[PDB]
């Protein structure tokens, strides 16, 4: 027979059925199950973002779970290809992985963005993320004190 699963409802309305043990990679969801077989609403995660969350959790299905020096070069090859998406998608992936509290997904996603800052001038970071320079000339001098 089948295995216990749970349904998650994106903000857009699409419902996603996921195996419970794959879903319990989200500590936020894991606690709800610890405490109605209708879907759990995620009004802050749209379908595309939730689709990519389930994809990531399905691939890391068989993975066992620091406070040291910072490393961002240790993203597995699969996650790098999977995280070749537009900036907005990455920003929403950090939001979703943060809300769902999936440490692994938040780690690779923030390290992906951190790698688009490493070795770049402040001017190059502005061009990368299309951030305007809201500094006054006098303000840009005090920051460089």
């Amino acid at each position: 027979g089948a295995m216990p699963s749970i349904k998650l409802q994106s903000s857009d309305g699409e419902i996603f059925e996921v195996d419970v043990e794959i879903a319990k990679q989200s500590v936020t969801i894991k606690t709800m199950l610890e405490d109605d077989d209708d879907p759990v609403p995620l009004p802050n995660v749209n379908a595309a973002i939730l689709k990519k969350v389930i994809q990531w959790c399905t691939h890391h299905k068989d993975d066992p779970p620091e406070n040291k020096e910072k490393r961002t070069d240790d993203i597995p090859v699969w996650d790098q290809e999977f995280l070749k998406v537009d900036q907005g998608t990455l920003f929403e992936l950090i939001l979703a992985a943060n809300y769902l509290d999936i440490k692994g997904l938040l780690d690779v996603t923030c390290k992906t963005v951190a790698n688009m800052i490493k070795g770049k001038t402040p001017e190059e970071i502005r061009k990368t993320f299309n951030i305007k320079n809201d500094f006054t000339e006098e303000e840009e001098a005090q920051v460089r004190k």
Partner: protein, 45 residues
């Protein structure tokens, strides 16, 4: 990316936890909001 919303703040401050002292010092010059998020006593300890 430069908006002053709670979404932009949660993202970049999640990102700034993975930056070294060198890359943080170059993010403070991007914009006024990044300068404020990079100067909180939790990134330097």
């Amino acid at each position: 990316a430069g908006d002053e919303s709670w979404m932009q703040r949660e993202v970049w401050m999640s990102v700034f936890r993975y930056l070294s002292r060198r890359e943080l010092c170059e993010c403070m010059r991007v914009c006024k909001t990044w300068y404020k998020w990079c100067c909180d006593k939790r990134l330097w300890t």
